[PDB]
Structure 1
Amino acid sequence: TLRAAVFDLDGVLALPAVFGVLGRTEEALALPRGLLNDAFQKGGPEGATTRLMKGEITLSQWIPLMEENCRKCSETAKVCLPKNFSIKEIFDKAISARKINRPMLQAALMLRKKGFTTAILTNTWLDDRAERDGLAQLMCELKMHFDFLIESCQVGMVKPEPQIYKFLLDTLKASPSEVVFLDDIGANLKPARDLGMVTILVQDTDTALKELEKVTGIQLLNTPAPLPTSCNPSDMSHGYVTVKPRVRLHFVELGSGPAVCLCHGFPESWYSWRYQIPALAQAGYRVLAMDMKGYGESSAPPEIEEYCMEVLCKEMVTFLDKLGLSQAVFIGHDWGGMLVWYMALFYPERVRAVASLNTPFIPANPNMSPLESIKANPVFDYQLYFQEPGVAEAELEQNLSRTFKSLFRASDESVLSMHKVCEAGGLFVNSPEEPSLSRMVTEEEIQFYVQQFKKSGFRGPLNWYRNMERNWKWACKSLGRKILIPALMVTAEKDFVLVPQMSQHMEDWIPHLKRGHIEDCGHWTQMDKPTEVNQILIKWLDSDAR
């Protein structure tokens, strides 16, 4: 009974295989067959290539010894190498052309999901080329999905020597019979066979995957589209910045490139962005996923005025100052989406680009009390229930598990009756005591919000809705302005409070505005449609954020 799957890198998890480049090079240059491919394996175990694969030497030291072996090989064949034949150029292009074999990674992912221990075992080199970063990036993207990465150059052993196989088994803490082993090279596959490991010769991925599901009994081919990579909180870099004597802001940080600040809504977490964080970092961005003031590991002062937009925006500017960031692209959802529009209106020099999910930009009406405006919309009745301090806190803090289970549900799992809320006496009055688990979330993810909300509760989060007058007065100062920085508005078809039609007049104030629209998406956008959220944001970030 199998419990481990092992994959080769070249020709297995990564395609096209770098090896197959000496063959294509011979064919393109009209050189004798296997001329380059054997100058490559010149001297077998004592040759330049074996020393490279054991980590005796680096790739840069290796380039000229391979060139030498290419000279000698041409001599014997009686042929001549071009004019500006370059081993370095051949290898740079081949390493650069090699991409992840996505269906192979998906199968490894699925096996690890179904309890398997997964590992990459590869014959590789110590890359010191000026362009080594491209490969380093690929190895970082691949490795995160596996329990182990065994590189020949780092262990001083090499396939097909049998000690690397015994090394592999020892690191797996398993007998050869509990192990599937995939390799595109028959000779490297043989010692694993000889030990009794289940082996697959990988030519085409499809056939290799049919063999893999046959042997594991796990469906890997024709599988439904998987969810994007999520975040495990204990594996993240956690950041803390004091913005004022009593306020510290917590954030999760991943990737390099332009700073992208993620601003969650009510009553959320940095964790509401779990499906966006690895995707945005992978797309070449430095992700800063905030725990907004009043939430998680961020400070939660009791005062109502501490949560008015003016102070929240000012603390976000200090946050950038303290981090030494002249700018960040601000991406908000719900209350975060509202903050994000104000950051663009009051601090455009600090915002590279602005994006909102569900929350539209609507200028304040100077001829109407914000309380009158909230009363004019029946779906906004919950906002009035939130006004009186302690009331919503008592209902929301009574059973945290029930709270998040009742809130965090897709548009087809409706448990709430957002109508006549203060009259009904609360949000969960017609709601079950033990709500079923939504398909959007696991029980584990619910317990994370439960644990996060145990520190400060709902007072600070609810205080975000308790500054309607202060926010209105402050917003009225921006009524002559327009948003002329790059901006994205993403609507969710099934958000029944922040309806897509609420965003219809936005180009009157944001003429260069770009849009996104998600169908069959409720209020909890990020976890409802993670795949399309990422697709819309990455595409917008690459076109308008730089």
Structure 2
Amino acid sequence: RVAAFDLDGVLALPSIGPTEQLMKGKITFSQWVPLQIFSQAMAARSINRPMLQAAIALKKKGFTTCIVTNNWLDDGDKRDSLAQMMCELSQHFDFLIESCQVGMIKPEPQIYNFLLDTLKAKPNEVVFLDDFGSNLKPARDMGMVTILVHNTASALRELEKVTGTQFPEAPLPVPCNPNDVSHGYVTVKPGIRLHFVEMGSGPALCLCHGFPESWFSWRYQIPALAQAGFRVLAIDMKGYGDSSSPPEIEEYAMELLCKEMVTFLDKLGIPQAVFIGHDWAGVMVWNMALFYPERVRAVASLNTPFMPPDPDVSPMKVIRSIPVFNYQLYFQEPGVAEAELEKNMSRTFKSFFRASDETGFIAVHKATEIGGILVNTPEDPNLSKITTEEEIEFYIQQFKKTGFRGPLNWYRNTERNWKWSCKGLGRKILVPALMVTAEKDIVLRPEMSKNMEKWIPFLKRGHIEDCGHWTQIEKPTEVNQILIKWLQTE
């Protein structure tokens, strides 16, 4: 079947002659100063989330969702209030049936037959619900499953849970994806192009992903950040997904990555953004902050701490010591781990992406002994409760284009990176910063960030309990909160 609700006050609230038909669309708001004080009433009404969530559910579930409300056209000033609130609901329903458009209001039987026509279905297999009920007269007539909404849910979730089946109580933020998205495509150097995704309106914040991921990762913070009130630019890190991913090694020097990261802003014409890296990106994100502070309004790292280099300590040597940094050494040899990971990506990803309470992880340190970062990993990885089968399939497809050379090439510029950063040795980071640490991150544990403020005074902190290395995907609702609260505050 299909499920429908009205907005008047069921999917948004607090709820609410020339007035009776401006609904039909023959007149605007401003041009209607007869029979004013509410150009705010509408303002002070936002989304009814448990209700809005009920939708994505059913849509994920197999229905077609809609809005068939009695509208009007706001040339108001608290107009945008509407735009956004609408631009928000937008993607989650397939049909927008508004009175101010199809000329026919609620409750004239029109809209109902019109609705049913619009999708083409029987009065029975389509449910409806209005805060009004005086509107559910017709729908009950024809023969459709009616539902009131006199509270802010109740039987809504409950009696509507009848539908097919139910929904939860503490939801994940909404996903977002993966072609209902703008696909920008800046080209920096000759052969080098950078793909990315865009959502929401300014100011800008670049979401730089890590190894071995894709922009797809922020799939939960992207919408949220947009709504937050920012223009998100979730990029595919050089070498990954739809951006150019050469074979050359020097190609992935940090010095390089950061420089290009700038040419990106230039080309796109932005003079400053909020860089927010995680994993190997956070490294860059901080270097970003260290080498081009102008173009950075603020920085946030996820799990990754600011790890300066000791001028009197070969960088390699230091990698050979941290027991857990083995895999990392394993990698250093070209074609090798490529060959290992590539062989069967299906396994590769479910092995990598597992939680903080998940068996079968990676072989961080035995990796050289065992001679393979997956050898203690099953042969038929169990789907991590932290991803879906499609969630994986995307990562695969996205990786079939690049292979693994390039993403791995990020490790392989060990010496030089050190060589280069050995200049931000005299400097200190001043532009707003945030270090969000994950309690149970096996490599890149919190402990490694305790000195940071020696470098980054004012460094603000974020800490998420029960975390894996897969922060966004694992504790998103949290990540969002913090991330937003951060941007809001500073």
Aligned equivalent of 1:199: 146
Q: Deviations over 1:153-181 (max 9, x none)?
A: 11111111111100111123210111211
Specify the SS of the correspondent of 2:213. Answer: coil
Question: C-alpha distance in 1, partners of 2:356/2:50?
Answer: 31
Alignment equivalent of 2:118, drawn from 148, 159, 171: 171
Task: Tell me if the contact between 2:195 and 2:243 (Cα under 8 Å) persists in the aligned partners.
Answer: yes
Question: C-alpha distance in 2, partners of 1:336/1:214?
Answer: 42
Task: Tell me if the contact between 1:107 and 1:209 (Cα under 8 Å) persists in the aligned partners.
Answer: no
Task: Tell me if the contact between 1:346 and 1:478 (Cα under 8 Å) persists in the aligned partners.
Answer: yes
Aligned equivalent of 2:79: 132
2:29 is equivalent to residue 100 of structure 1: no
2:97 is equivalent to residue 150 of structure 1: yes
Aligned equivalent of 1:56: 26
Alignment equivalent of 2:430, drawn from 465, 484, 507: 484
2:464 is equivalent to residue 518 of structure 1: yes
* Correspondence list, 1:517-536, <5 A: 517-536=463-482
Task: Tell me if the contact between 2:12 and 2:48 (Cα under 8 Å) persists in the aligned partners.
Answer: yes
Aligned equivalent of 2:346: 401
Specify the SS of the correspondent of 2:247. Answer: coil
Question: C-alpha distance in 1, partners of 2:367/2:116?
Answer: 61
Specify the SS of the correspondent of 1:166. Answer: helix
Q: CA RMSD in A?
A: 1.3
The offset of 1:232, in angstroms, is 1.3
Question: C-alpha distance in 2, partners of 1:205/1:459?
Answer: 53
Specify the SS of the correspondent of 2:43. Answer: helix
Question: C-alpha distance in 2, partners of 1:148/1:281?
Answer: 23
Aligned equivalent of 2:383: 437
Aligned equivalent of 1:330: 275
The offset of 1:401, in angstroms, is 0.9
Aligned equivalent of 1:350: 295
Task: Tell me if the contact between 1:410 and 1:522 (Cα under 8 Å) persists in the aligned partners.
Answer: yes
Larger radius of gyration: 1
Specify the SS of the correspondent of 2:183. Answer: strand
Distance 1:210 1:302, change over 3 A: closer
Query: Number of matched residues?
Result: 489
Aligned equivalent of 1:11: 9
The offset of 1:11, in angstroms, is 2.1
Task: Tell me if the contact between 1:261 and 1:331 (Cα under 8 Å) persists in the aligned partners.
Answer: yes
Aligned equivalent of 1:65: 34
Task: Tell me if the contact between 2:148 and 2:156 (Cα under 8 Å) persists in the aligned partners.
Answer: no
Q: Deviations over 1:30-85 (max 9, x none)?
A: xxxxxxxxxxxxxxxxx3123201111111111x233xxxxxxxxxxxxxxxxxxx
The offset of 1:263, in angstroms, is 0.7
With normalisation by structure 2, the TM-score equals 0.97
Aligned equivalent of 2:443: 497
Unaligned runs of 5+ in 1: 19-46, 67-86
Question: C-alpha distance in 2, partners of 1:159/1:329?
Answer: 45
Question: C-alpha distance in 2, partners of 1:91/1:206?
Answer: 25
Question: Percent identity between the aligned chains?
Answer: 76
Specify the SS of the correspondent of 1:104. Answer: helix
2:373 is equivalent to residue 427 of structure 1: yes
2:291 is equivalent to residue 341 of structure 1: no
Specify the SS of the correspondent of 1:256. Answer: coil
Letter aligned with residue 5 of structure 1: A
With normalisation by structure 1, the TM-score equals 0.88
Aligned equivalent of 1:237: 182
Specify the SS of the correspondent of 1:401. Answer: helix
Task: Tell me if the contact between 1:249 and 1:291 (Cα under 8 Å) persists in the aligned partners.
Answer: yes
Task: Tell me if the contact between 1:200 and 1:211 (Cα under 8 Å) persists in the aligned partners.
Answer: no
Task: Tell me if the contact between 2:271 and 2:295 (Cα under 8 Å) persists in the aligned partners.
Answer: yes
Divergent runs of 4+, >3 A: none
Question: C-alpha distance in 2, partners of 1:208/1:15?
Answer: 17
Aligned equivalent of 2:131: 184
Distance 1:263 1:15, change over 3 A: same
